[PDB]
């Protein structure tokens, strides 16, 4: 019985810096944030488009338009070079100001 949620910022980049290839689509962190926690998915859905809101609200992630219709939409969320190791360090970090 343990849902201990992270940052809104942070369970987008703690997972993409546990994804093996530095690039994940939208439904990576609906992929993370669960492959952590039991379930948070299958009972609270206002945190599930939450994470796409933090997808812009931060930029260092590499969002393309189009693609190679690899994960079949257009759309993907991936961190940069110089961007990645900036928003991993907001998220492995957690939310508690001085």
């Known amino acids: 019985d343990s849902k201990p949620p992270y940052s809104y910022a942070q ?3 703690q997972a993409i ?3 093996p290839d530095k690039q994940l689509t939208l439904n990576g962190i609906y992929t993370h944030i669960t492959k ?3 379930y948070y998915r ?3 859905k206002g ?3 939450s994470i796409r809101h933090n997808l812009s609200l931060n930029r260092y992630f590499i969002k393309v338009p189009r693609s ?3 994960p079949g939409k257009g759309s993907f969320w991936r961190i940069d070079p110089a961007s990645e190791s900036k928003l991993i360090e907001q998220a492995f970090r ?3 100001p001085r």
């Open 94 to 96: 957690k939310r508690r």
């Open 68 to 70: 190679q219709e690899e």
């Open 47 to 49: 945190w599930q488009n």
């Open 36 to 38: 952590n926690y039991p």
């Open 42 to 44: 299958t009972a609270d």
């Open 17 to 19: 810096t546990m994804a």
């Open 11 to 13: 369970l987008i980049v």
